Each structure stands twice: as structure tokens, then as C-alpha cells.
Amino acid sequence: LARQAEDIDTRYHPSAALRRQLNKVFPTHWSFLLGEIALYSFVVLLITGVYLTLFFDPSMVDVTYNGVYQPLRGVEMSRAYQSALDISFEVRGGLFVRQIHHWAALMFAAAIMVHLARIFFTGAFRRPRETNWVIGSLLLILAMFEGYFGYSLPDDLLSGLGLRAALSSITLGMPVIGTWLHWALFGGDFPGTILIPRLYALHILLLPGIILALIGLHLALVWFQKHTQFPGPGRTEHNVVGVRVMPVFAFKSGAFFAAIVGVLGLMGGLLQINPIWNLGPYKPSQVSAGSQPDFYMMWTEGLARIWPPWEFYFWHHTIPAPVWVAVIMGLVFVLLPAYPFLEKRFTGDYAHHNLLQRPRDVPVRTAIGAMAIAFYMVLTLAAMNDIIALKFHISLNATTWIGRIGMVILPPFVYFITYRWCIGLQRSDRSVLEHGVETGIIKRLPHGAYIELHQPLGPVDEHGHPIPLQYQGAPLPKRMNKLGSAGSPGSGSFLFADSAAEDAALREAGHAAEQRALAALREH
Amino acid sequence: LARQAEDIDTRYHPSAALRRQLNKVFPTHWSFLLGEIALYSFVVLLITGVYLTLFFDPSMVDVTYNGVYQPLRGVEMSRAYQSALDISFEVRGGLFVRQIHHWAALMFAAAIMVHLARIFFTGAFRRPRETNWVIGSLLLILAMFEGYFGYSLPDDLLSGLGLRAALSSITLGMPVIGTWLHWALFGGDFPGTILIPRLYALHILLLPGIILALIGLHLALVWFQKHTQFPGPGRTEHNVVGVRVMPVFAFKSGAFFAAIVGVLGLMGGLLQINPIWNLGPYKPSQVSAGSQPDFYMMWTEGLARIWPPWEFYFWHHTIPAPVWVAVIMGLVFVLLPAYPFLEKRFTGDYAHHNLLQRPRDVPVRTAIGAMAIAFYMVLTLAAMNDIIALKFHISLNATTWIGRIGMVILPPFVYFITYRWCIGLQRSDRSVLEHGVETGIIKRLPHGAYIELHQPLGPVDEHGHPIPLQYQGAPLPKRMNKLGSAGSPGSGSFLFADSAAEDAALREAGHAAEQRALAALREH
Amino acid sequence: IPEEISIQERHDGASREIDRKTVVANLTDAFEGSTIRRRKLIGLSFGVGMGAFGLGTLVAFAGGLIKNPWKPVVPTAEGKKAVLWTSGWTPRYQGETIYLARATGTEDGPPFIKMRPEDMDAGGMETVFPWRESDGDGTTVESHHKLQEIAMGIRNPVMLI
Amino acid sequence: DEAALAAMSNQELLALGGKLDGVRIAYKEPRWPVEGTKAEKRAERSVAVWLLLGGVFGLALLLIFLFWPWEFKAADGESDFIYSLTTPLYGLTFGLSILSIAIGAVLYQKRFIPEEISIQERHDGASREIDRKTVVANLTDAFEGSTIRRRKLIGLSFGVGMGAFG
Ligand SMILES: CC(C)=CCC/C(C)=C\CC/C(C)=C/CC/C(C)=C/CC/C(C)=C/CC/C(C)=C\CC/C(C)=C\CC/C(C)=C\CC/C(C)=C\CC1=C(C)C(=O)c2ccccc2C1=O
Ligand code: HEM
Ligand code: HEM
Ligand SMILES: CCc1nc2ccc(Cl)cn2c1C(=O)NCc1ccc(N2CCC(c3ccc(OC(F)(F)F)cc3)CC2)cc1
Ligand SMILES: CCc1nc2ccc(Cl)cn2c1C(=O)NCc1ccc(N2CCC(c3ccc(OC(F)(F)F)cc3)CC2)cc1
Numbered sequence A, B: 001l002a003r004q005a006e007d008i009d010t011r012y013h014p015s016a017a018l019r020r021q022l023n024k025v026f027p028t029h030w031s032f033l034l035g036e037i038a039l040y041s042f043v044v045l046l047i048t049g050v051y052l053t054l055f056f057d058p059s060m061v062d063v064t065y066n067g068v069y070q071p072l073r074g075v076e077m078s079r080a081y082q083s084a085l086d087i088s089f090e091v092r093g094g095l096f097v098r099q100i101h102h103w104a105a106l107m108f109a110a111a112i113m114v115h116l117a118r119i120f121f122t123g124a125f126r127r128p129r130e131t132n133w134v135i136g137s138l139l140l141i142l143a144m145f146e147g148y149f150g151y152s153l154p155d156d157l158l159s160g161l162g163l164r165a166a167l168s169s170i171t172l173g174m175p176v177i178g179t180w181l182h183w184a185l186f187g188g189d190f191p192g193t194i195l196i197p198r199l200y201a202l203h204i205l206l207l208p209g210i211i212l213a214l215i216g217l218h219l220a221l222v223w224f225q226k227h228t229q230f231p232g233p234g235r236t237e238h239n240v241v242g243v244r245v246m247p248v249f250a251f252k253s254g255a256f257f258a259a260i261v262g263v264l265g266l267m268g269g270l271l272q273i274n275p276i277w278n279l280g281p282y283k284p285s286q287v288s289a290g291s292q293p294d295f296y297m298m299w300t301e302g303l304a305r306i307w308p309p310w311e312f313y314f315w316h317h318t319i320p321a322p323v324w325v326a327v328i329m330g331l332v333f334v335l336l337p338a339y340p341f342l343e344k345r346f347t348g349d350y351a352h353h354n355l356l357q358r359p360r361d362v363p364v365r366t367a368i369g370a371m372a373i374a375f376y377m378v379l380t381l382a383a384m385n386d387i388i389a390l391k392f393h394i395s396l397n398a399t400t401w402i403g404r405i406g407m408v409i410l411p412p413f414v415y416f417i418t419y420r421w422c423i424g425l426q427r428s429d430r431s432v433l434e435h436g437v438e439t440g441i442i443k444r445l446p447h448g449a450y451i452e453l454h455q456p457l458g459p460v461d462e463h464g465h466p467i468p469l470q471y472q473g474a475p476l477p478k479r480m481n482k483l484g485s486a487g488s489p490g491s492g493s494f495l496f497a498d499s500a501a502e503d504a505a506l507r508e509a510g511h512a513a514e515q516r517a518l519a520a521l522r523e524h
Numbered sequence C: 001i002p003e004e005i006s007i008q009e010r011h012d013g014a015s016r017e018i019d020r021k022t023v024v025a026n027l028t029d030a031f032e033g034s035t036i037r038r039r040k041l042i043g044l045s046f047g048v049g050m051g052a053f054g055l056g057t058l059v060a061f062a063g064g065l066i067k068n069p070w071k072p073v074v075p076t077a078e079g080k081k082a083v084l085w086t087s088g089w090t091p092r093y094q095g096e097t098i099y100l101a102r103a104t105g106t107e108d109g110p111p112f113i114k115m116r117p118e119d120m121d122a123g124g125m126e127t128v129f130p131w132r133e134s135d136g137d138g139t140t141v142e143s144h145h146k147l148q149e150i151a152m153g154i155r156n157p158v159m160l161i
Numbered sequence D: 001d002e003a004a005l006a007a008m009s010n011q012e013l014l015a016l017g018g019k020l021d022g023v024r025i026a027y028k029e030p031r032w033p034v035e036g037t038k039a040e041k042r043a044e045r046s047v048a049v050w051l052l053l054g055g056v057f058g059l060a061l062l063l064i065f066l067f068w069p070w071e072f073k074a075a076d077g078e079s080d081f082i083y084s085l086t087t088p089l090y091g092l093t094f095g096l097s098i099l100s101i102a103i104g105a106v107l108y109q110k111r112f113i114p115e116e117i118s119i120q121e122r123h124d125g126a127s128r129e130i131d132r133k134t135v136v137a138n139l140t141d142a143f144e145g146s147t148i149r150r151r152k153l154i155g156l157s158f159g160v161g162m163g164a165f166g
Helices: A002-012 A017-022 A030-052 A079-090 A094-122 A127-151 A157-171 A179-186 A195-224 A245-270 A298-305 A322-335 A339-347 A363-381 A385-391 A396-434 A500-523 B002-012 B017-022 B030-052 B079-090 B094-122 B127-151 B157-171 B179-186 B195-224 B245-270 B298-305 B322-335 B339-347 B363-381 B385-391 B396-434 B500-523 C017-033 C040-061 C141-151 D010-021 D038-067 D086-111 D129-145 D152-165
Strands: A062-064 A076-078 A241-244 B062-064 B076-078 B241-244 C074-076 C079-081 C100-103 C126-130 C158-160 D026-029 D115-119
Touching: A017 A245, A017 D129, A030 A094, A030 A195, A030 A245, A076 A079, A079 A094, A094 A127, A094 A245, A094 A363, A127 A195, A127 A339, A127 B002, A157 A179, A157 A322, A195 B195, A241 A245, A245 D129, A298 A322, A298 A363, A298 A396, A363 A396, A385 A396, B017 B245, B017 C017, B017 D010, B030 B094, B030 B195, B030 B245, B076 B079, B079 B094, B094 B127, B094 B245, B094 B363, B094 D086, B127 B195, B127 B339, B157 B179, B157 B322, B241 B245, B245 C017, B245 D086, B298 B322, B298 B363, B298 B396, B363 B396, B385 B396, B500 D026, B500 D038, B500 D115, C017 D010, C040 D038, C040 D086, C126 C141, D038 D086
Parallel strands: none
Antiparallel strands: A062 A076, B062 B076, B241 D115, C074 C079, C100 C126, C126 C158, D026 D115
């Protein structure tokens, strides 16, 4: 479209920033898409939530149902619960959309956690990027609380119990402020008339706006501080080796977006999540057995379950037990964003870093991370006590005490094992550097001796033994077939062979192109 | 803060984009702040609306008031009206905040209209900036509809009448689609149960988001296509003469922001707007006498009032009168964004332009704009028929016919007068270019002749008459005192004089600096 | 799509000294030229003024939400108490009868009915609510409101063993 | 330049930055060339009293918001007239405080910050041919290299598929 392109060029003349953005190089490691997963989940959340806002009515006034769902006719409920039932049963395709919304929220949280694990273990938070780590931590906290406020909207029995217990009766117990916070937030005592509209406003407008601003800032910082990379053949602290945006990277990103949307649609159509009609409207007099929040608050619930009943009563006052949960959760939320500064104070290393570390080269940090993950898993499993004790025949008090003791003895055990495992991996790497790659072939050496036919990775000395290499922070091959050793199948389709000339030509050109890629990337 | 600044510099190294943005030059004309006014009004709207969302409940269920406002106790009303009454009477400082909100909406609309008038009359929409004109037009439409949806939220008698008439019964009358649109929007017949929540979602989330995106794009386009300027001493089509951002422009912008916030606070505290309690809750059986919308929809109302009753009845069908209002409204909204292309097709001028035009140098466009403004004023005054006929003792039918005839005879009269006025101004400029500036002094010239002692603006010939100058698109002085002719008062404070040395020194240095500024800007 | 490899030339670290020196000179000259450093009174008055405006504004912004949890609003037999100490089981006029009503789950006339001690065996449990016969059954709108407020009170339910 | 960029004074650095950006500041002038006079002290005192007023009435806003009778009291027996003045006082204190601050700032800019004129070097129009040719070559090569032009079936099936999904 020559005329339109030229007229855009005389009116705006970008032609240089477009060239500067079309030539940007991005590294290609499978581990660098765990943030794209979260970004795409957030986009799907935005779209489905904008759809949902056209049918939801966030009031707490009481009505009688008089709808299509018969086992609930004549029951008195709030207006939000009725609006959610109307979305579920009286809009063509509404149940599908809210199920997609909930599944996308779950995938958002899970992808954020996996991305954080990557960032922590590879060491991508060092000198140039502590602030980007901090922004990520804030994003994590906001996502947690946004999901909570979200699933507490269509007030039914389970959401009501969660709200009541956690919000009302942990805010009510804080030492001095306490009830003042409770009355500022609820407008009075727990079941009010302004809670659900306030949560609705917080959930559709404020927290999404803050999250959008922080995500923009995060991606800008990642764009202008170029990406990190793993050590390898042609990689230095001064260059980025990968593919340009122009043909390839946008294509791969868009295809990944479409595949994630496909997975979310499939599992939002085939699996059922939050069937609010099986529950009832919230009433302060009735309860059920499950309880349980979504899996990103289960650690908070489990911590409240397995913490012993230690209270303090002094003059004319009372400090209850959930205060402990409050300070422990605050301590966790404060220890997360302040980790890079702690590590740089303790190790005393303040240099710029653009090459990542393999998790096996840093045993102490890997052990710390494994200990934290074990602690989190214990806290999460201590939240499904009832389900575990019912399905697997175990006592309930037994599960409580198992959690209460594991909380102390599992983290150090995991630390010890992880440290020893990291050093074992290092030794296994050094052995294949010193000798060659084991091929698995045995010989008998006419004077009855068995050898195993190693294969060298570099030069050899006078008597056939390879000269040992030096470690360079890059992974080493361990299987002979990963190196081209046994390959080149036929060149048919699946049941009929091709000609021999075609097979030879294709094999030979493929070999040539492989060798040229190798020789080109070495030499730079 | 040397340590912090340097560590920011080794982590981000901007140091060049910051220098590129601290040296940007902005022209300084009083007419270039009419967009800042609208921007600041929008910011205040955002803040006050975020405050308001914490107390509003958008339901249409019926309740009995039982509040503090006594003349309404026992009356049955919706939940939105009760929430608005509770904001007004039971939150410390809520009435003040909603009055600020409404006044800021009004100032937003007025500032947008004045800014559009400037952009149109100075010719700042030519070749490089048609798309920026288009974005501005879209912003105007969105602001209109957002304000409408906003003041229709606390459903009282006036807002209900406005909704009913305009929305329901103009959407109901469209030729073929019609009732289908009505039922898709209201969920059924007019008074539904999903209207107010849907308007709430549209008003706090969607339209503000679209407006924010469009404002960002608008300001980006203005930032990267540098500002226009008026012709003058050292101004060319290739440079920008003004002040740098660094010390001055940010300071002036912030001071203007604070002054606008001050004006809005004052007039939101001292003047009363929309007293919903004097009205009642909306009921389809009762009505009042003044049923006008805010001043940016008054033209729509007036057009509906003064359009004659022309309907068409053919086989089994009916085309009512408000269809006419619909097509005229759409025609206006389509003719606004497509004006630059019309003018470039009609005049045949396709060149780049960075210097503005004085409205007196383009008589035809100025006459067109004056005609459009006269049409708008007629339509707006035809909307307050009742108030005009009541306060000023005129018949009501008389006002209807006055509007109906003015709608045809006022625009052309205004066109004619504006054309002649522009050419008169041009001639007045040419006269002071040919001769000098009239001083107003009379002499008697001993043979009884009266002359008037002109004052030349340039060189003079042999016999004292000035040689005529050439017009350069810049304004010319007309009063002798605007040129330094009679100045230099005393240098006291107000009642006590200073020393003579101080007075002489200050006067003399001031004169020197003025002369140096002049001589410097000429020579470049 | 063809296979490719590229290299990007990071150019990280501190800026070139040219840009650092020029931008710091620009900032320092913009600051020293205003002469604000040797104007103490203007600066300090400006500070106090902005601080007072900001404080007053923030207090007015966050002042409509704050409520006192201990103001007496609930009428009882010894005056008026705070909400957090009344229960609905609290007597109102010094000797009123409050029955232990039970829920029936139906809305013809009774959502709450009185109880007798013989309506329970030695291994039973039942939830009960305060009745206050002046509330009546759920026929009119007034009694319906009273009953729907009895049913939703976070300190009302009681187990009868 | 050089390493000897140091030992250079402030004004040469500022003009160097300006010329690097294309800005050429002409006619920079202080406001008070003579030393301490009474006019300078008077202007400083006038600029200061406005900010003092702004702060004083911000404090007044705080006090009024805290200690003023605000509840609805309207009737015809006890004519309140104190409740009818509760919102006007909020507005009168808030707006006037921030207006005084703004006026003080404008006066400070008008009477103490030096007067200047600058010129910016627009550089408008089409791009240099270098960038146009290079970017169009990049786009054309990225398109022709994928060979999609001579693959009709893939393109048309892709189009129909995306259209149906959308
Ligand atoms: C037009 C009008 C005036 C006519 C009048 C009509 C009428 C009368 C008036 C209005 C009436 C009403 C009914 C109108 C209805 C309007 C209604 C409310 C429409 C709502 C609009 C719409 C449906 C909302 C939903 C859609 C929307 C929410 C989705 C947009 C997606 C969002 C905004 C983007 C967020 C993400 C963004 C910040 C990042 C973008 C991606 C970035 C730039 C690239 C990603 C990326 C980056 C940046 C890396 O650095 C990177 C580094 C290493 C590896 C990978 C990456 C990587 O993938
Ligand atoms: C950004 C992160 C978000 C998260 C983690 C999240 C999470 C949730 C969850 C888990 C629910 C419960 C849905 C159900 O159980 O049926 C929900 C409800 C809802 N969400 Fe979101 N959401 C997000 C963003 C949004 C956005 C951006 C919007 C609107 C623009 C939105 C609109 C809604 C609405 C209206 C509901 C209530 C409707 C219903 O419950 O059926 N959400 N949210
Ligand atoms: C952007 C342009 C906007 C305009 C022109 C506008 C206009 C209006 C107007 C005139 C009212 C009537 C207020 C009254 O009479 O008391 C109103 C009400 C309201 N506005 Fe806005 N508004 C805008 C943005 C917003 C935003 C961004 C929000 C929230 C984030 C918001 C929230 C509200 C609420 C909740 C109400 C109803 C509360 C009440 O009526 O007291 N508005 N709007
Ligand atoms: C015990 C938890 C639990 N049991 C069950 C049982 C059944 C079901 Cl279905 C769900 N649950 C949950 C549950 O939902 N857990 C998620 C959760 C936990 C805590 C918080 N928090 C609110 C704010 C508080 C707060 C706020 C402000 C403060 O002021 C300060 F100091 F300034 F910050 C201090 C504390 C802290 C805890 C939210 C969600
Ligand atoms: C007559 C107006 C009026 N009389 C009174 C009397 C008393 C009071 Cl208090 C207020 N008023 C008002 C009033 O408030 N006027 C503002 C107004 C006018 C028209 C519209 N309509 C919205 C959408 C419709 C529409 C929808 C879809 C369309 O799509 C299609 F069909 F394809 F074209 C086209 C048009 C048209 C405009 C909104 C607000």
C-alpha cells in the first residue's frame, strides 16, 4: 500500500524507531514464556469481566427468587445471588463465560507463581533488576487479593463464611485499631448493607487499574533493560544471542497466545467450577463441611488451622490468637520483596550481571528456595484436612498434629537433601568433563578385561585419553543419541518410501546446514 | 542526592532522554492552555468519582426511606435514590464532593467546546494534524454521552423523564431495528430492573477507560508532532520559539492546575447544583415543569422541540417524528470529524503547515464557524422556552415560532455580517501599515489646517512620510501607549517613595534588558 | 520460516560522561538561576503552606469513612449500649418474655414457632432464635421485616442440647 | 570531545547540551541586576504573604472539618442556620487555600525566575531516505522470505479459518 505508507511517512516519519524495534533480539529459551502465560491470562480476564459486568447487580437487599431454577423457588436471597443465578441459568452462554473467568483467574495465579520460581532460582534479580523484582512482588500480592474479592462477590454460603471468618474476625482482633478498621470497612457490624457494592467497586475498577499500570511498568523495564541469557557457546555479558522480533518472535508469541486461549476455553467448557446453585444464599445460622478458599489463600487458612491457641490477657484487655496469623502473613509479605538486598548484604557481591546461573551452581540459594516451597506445600495441605481425612482414612487430630510438626521438621530436612543433591549434580558434571561421554558399550580386551568405550568431547593426547576440559557454566551432554550418533531414518511419509536421490539430497543438505550453523556461532 | 542519582544512572542510564525532554521548547500564548483546562477537569473528575464509588448502590429495588430527611420519610423509593440521599445527608462532606463532581463535569464540557473553537478558527487542523482532529471529535462525543449517563444515575423524577423520553422513545422509533435495540438495551419494556446497574458499569468503567486511552494518544501525538505557532518576528515554518520545559513550563502548568482546582472547589462549595431531595423518586405518573438536561444536550432537546410534526404512514407501518432528530443528530456527528478533508477537497491545498492563521485572514471559514455557533445558540435557547416565557413575559407559542424561524434566518445573516467584519478588520490593518499609528494629537499649522501627527513604524522618505510596509501575518499596534510612549511611574511602594539612585538604576537596567531581548530575537 | 541467529550489542552501564555532565549542568543552572537557595522566607512559607493544604485535604478525604464503634445506639433496659455488646437476647423493658422459637422452613404463616420441653429426645440438638411474641407471624410487611432481621443476626443462634 | 571535558564551566556545558539537542537559548537575563534594594525585599514579602495565607486557611479547613456542626437539623422550630453554612465553609476554605498557593507560585515565576527565549529546530517532514529504504527493505525481506506469497492454499485456508473463528 505504497500511497498510504508514504503519506504516513511524510506525516510522522518514524522509519527509524520502527527499524529500531523490528531488529530487537530476544533469547529463545522455553523458560522465558512463563510470563507470557500470565499476561495472556490477564487479557482473557479483562475481556470476560467486561462481558460479565453487563448482567451483575451488586446489592444486598432481600428478594424472593421466583425464577427458573425450581429447587430454590420461594427462598429469600440477596440481589447479587439472584443476579448470579440469572447469569447462570437465563443468559445464553453465561455459565460458560463465568467458568472461563474463574479458570483464567486460577491460571493467572499459578503462572505467576511458576514465573516467580524461575526468576528466583536462575538468579535474574541481581544488580540491574532489584526494582523489577519489587514490582513483581507487588503484582503478586495484588493478584491474590483481587481474586479473593472476586470470588466473594456472588454472596453464597461458602463466600459468606470466608468473608466473615477471615476479613471480619481477623480485622476485628488487631491490638489497638481493630474495631475501628472493622467499622470503617464494613460501615458497622459484619453483615451490613455497603459491603458488596464496595467490593464490586474495588474489584472491577481500582485493583485492575493498579495492576494494569504495574504491568505496563514491568514490561517497559524488561524492554529497555534487555533480557538476560544462559551461558553458552557465543554468549557474553555484552551481547544478546537469539532471534529478531521481525519475522519470528511476534509469530511465536501470537501462536502461544492462541494456544493458551484454546486450553482455557476447553477446560472452561469441560470442567465445572464454583456451582453456586448447589449452595444456598448466605445465612449466618447454617454452615457446611468443606469451607476452603481458592488455592492461593489455602496457606493462610492452613496457618490459621495449625497455629496453637496462645492468647494474652492483661489488665482490662485481650490479645486473641489470629493476631499471630496477622503478623506472620505480614512478615512473609515483607520478606518477599526485600530478598535481593538481604542476599547482597550477606554475600557481599555488588556487580552487574547479565548471564544467568544454573540452580545447581548455587547450592545455598537452591536449598533456601526448596525449603520455602516445602513450607508452602505443608501449609497448603494442612488446609484440606477434612478432605484428606475423609477420602484417605486418617484421623483428623492426627492430620492436625502431622501438620503442626511437619511445619518444623520438613523444611530443614528438605534443605539438607537439596544441598547434597546440588553438589552431587556438580560432581556428575565434572566427571563427564574429565573423561568422555559414556556410550554403554562393553569390550573384553583379550586378557579378560572389561572397558566401557567413552567418547571424548575435545582433543586427545598421545595415548588416546582425552585432555580434561574446563567448566564454562553450560550444560553438558550425557546421552550419545543427543549428539548425532544414531539418526537419519528413512525419508518416506509413513508407509511408502521416497526415491533414493531425494533422501540423499535432503540428508546431505541438512548435514551441511547444521555444520554451518555450528561453525558460524563458534567463530563470533 | 549523589549516591542515589548515580546508582540510578548505572542501572538505567537515561541521561539522554531526560536531557532530550528537559530541553523541549513550548510556545507561550494564552490561547494554548484551553486544553490544559479540560485535562485538569478530567483529573478532578477521576478523583472525585473514585471517592463517590465507595458509597453508591446501583439497584432498582424498592424500599421505604426511613432516614434523617423528614419530608421524605415513609416514601417508597429505589435503592439508588436512597444511596444518593445517604451520600447527601449522612456522610460528612459527601454533598460537597458530589457538587464538585457535577461542577467539574460542566467545566469539562465547556473547556472542550472552547478548545474546539480555537482549533477550528486558527486553522490548526491542516495537513499534519487531521487525525488529531478526528481523535478530538471522538473525545467530544464520548464526553457528552458520559455526562448524560452520569447524571441519570441517582434516578429521580427529572433524570427519569430524561431517560424515558430521549433514550426509550427515540430508540423505540427507529425504522426497522427499533424495538429490537430497545429490548436489547433495557432488557424489556422501559422501566426494567437492569437499566441502572448497566448504566453504572458503563459510566464508571468503560467510557472512562476509552476516554483515558484516547487522551493518552492525543497528548502523545501533540508531543511528537511539535506545537504550532503564530507568525511573528523570529518565527518560521522550521523552528519553535518559546520557553524550555526545564525551569518554566512545568512551573506554569502546575500553577494553572492549582488555580483551576481552586476555582472548582470554590464554586462547588458556594453554588448549589442538582438538589435531588427537592425532587422525588421517579414515578411514571407524575411530572414537573422544567424538564431540561445539562447544557450539552440542550441542543438535542431544542431540536426535538422546534421540529415540525412530519410523519409518514404507509402500508401497515409508521415512521414517527423523532426519526428526524435521529438523522439530524447523526449528520452533525458525521460532519464534525470529516471537515478537514472537505476543506482540502474544496480549496485544493495539500501542503504542510506549522504557522497558524489569524481568523481575520480567512473570511469564509470564520463566517462558516460563526454561522454554526449561531445555529447552536438558537438550538440551545429554544430548549429553555418555559423559563424564558415565564421570567420574560413572552408567549410560549411565540417562542416556539421564533425558534422555528430563527433556525433558518439567523445563520445566513450571521454569515454575511461576519464576512464583512473580517474584511473590515483587514482594511483597518492595511491602513496602519500604509500610514503610521495615530497618536490623537491635533495641530493647527499656521495657515489654519488640522493634522493628526501619525507615528511611523519603519523608515521614512525625504519629505517625512513613512514608506509603506508589507503585511507579514502578525498583529500590529494601534494604541501609542502599548508601544513604550508614556510609562515609567515612580518606584516607591504605594505611599512612600524610594531613593532617586535606585529609581534611575532600575529604570535604566530595565530599558537595557528590553532592548537586548528585542535585538536578540530580531537577528536570529 | 528461515532459521536465524542474531547479536544485539547491549551497550549497558553508566551513560557517556558527555550526557551526565550536560544534564547535571542543566539541572543545577535551572535551580541556581531561580535564586531560591538564598530566599529562605519564601521557601519555608511555601513548605508550610503546601503541608497544611495537603494535610487538611487528606483529612477531609478520609474523614467520611471513620465511625465510632462505641456510640450507644441500641436501646436496652439500662439505657443504650454499643452494638458489640447487645445480642438480640437482650431484654428491652425489664421483664419481657423471649421465647426459644425454632425455624420451620416454610412461609405460609410460621417461620418461627414456640417449643415445649417434650419436643426432643435425650440425644437431640436444635437451633433456636429469640421470638418476642410482639413480632408476630410473617403476614404483614412490618412483621416480615422484623422476622427477616431476627433471622440474620450474627449473635442470635443458639444450640439446645 | 575529549577527556578534558572537565575544567569547563557551567555555561559552556549548558550551551553544549543545547546544541546537542538543537536548542539555542537566546537572551537569558536575571531579574535583579542591582544588589539588595527595597523593591526586591518588597517583592519577596509580597510573594511570601500569599503562601502564608494559603497555609493558614488550609489549617482553617482542617479545623472547620473537625469541629463544625454538620448533621441535618432542618425544621421550622429550631431554625439552625449553622447547618446551612456547613458546605459553604468547606468550599470557602479549601478553594481559597489552594488558590492562594497558586497565586503565590505565579507571582514567584513572574518576578524571580529569569526571563528567557529559546528556539527548537523542528526537523519536520519525511524521513531521511536512509531510514525509509532500510525499513522498507526489512519489511519486504521478512515478507518474501517466508515464501507465503507462492503458497496460495495455506494463505486462503488461514483466512477462512480466522474469519470463521472471529
Ligand atoms: C465511537 C462512539 C463515539 C460512537 C457512539 C456510540 C454510543 C452512542 C456511545 C457509547 C455507548 C456504549 C454502548 C458504547 C459501548 C462501549 C463498551 C464499554 C466497549 C468496551 C471496550 C472493550 C470491549 C473492552 C475489552 C477489551 C480490552 C479490555 C482488551 C485490550 C487489551 C489491553 C488493554 C492490553 C493490556 C496489556 C498491555 C499493557 C501490554 C501489551 C503487550 C506488550 C506491548 C507486548 C508484550 C511483551 C513485551 C512488552 C515484552 O517486553 C516481552 C519481553 C520478553 C518476552 C515477551 C514480551 C512480550 O510478550
Ligand atoms: C484481573 C484479575 C481478576 C481476577 C483474579 C478475577 C477473579 C474473579 C473471580 C474468581 C470471580 C468469581 C466468578 C465466579 O465465581 O462466578 C470474579 C467475578 C467477577 N469478575 Fe473478576 N477477576 C479479575 C478481573 C476482572 C475484571 C477486569 C472485571 C471487569 C472489567 C471483572 C469482573 C467480574 C465480575 C462482574 C464478577 C462477578 C460476576 C460473577 O460473579 O458471576 N473481573 N472475578
Ligand atoms: C469522565 C467524565 C465524567 C463525567 C462527565 C461525569 C459526570 C457525572 C455527573 C454530572 C454526575 C451527577 C452527579 C450528581 O448530580 O450528584 C455523575 C455521577 C456519578 N459519577 Fe460521574 N462523571 C464522569 C466520570 C466519572 C468517573 C470516572 C467515575 C468513577 C470512577 C464517576 C462516578 C460517578 C458516580 C458513582 C456517580 C453517581 C453518584 C452520585 O450521583 O452522587 N464519574 N457523573
Ligand atoms: C483464617 C483464614 C480463613 N479461614 C477460612 C475458613 C473458611 C473459608 Cl471459606 C475461608 N477462610 C479463610 C480465608 O478466607 N483466608 C484468606 C484471607 C486471610 C486473611 C486475610 N486478611 C484480611 C486483612 C487482615 C488485616 C487488614 C488490615 C490490617 O491493618 C494493618 F495492620 F494496617 F495492615 C491488618 C490485618 C489480615 C488478614 C484475607 C484473606
Ligand atoms: C429529545 C431529547 C430530550 N427531550 C427531553 C425532555 C426532558 C428532559 Cl429532562 C430531557 N430531554 C431530552 C434529552 O435528554 N436529550 C439528550 C439525548 C437525546 C437523544 C439521545 N439518543 C440516544 C441514542 C439514540 C440512538 C440510538 C441508536 C441509534 O442507532 C441507529 F438507529 F442505527 F441510528 C441511533 C440513535 C439517539 C439519541 C440521547 C440523549
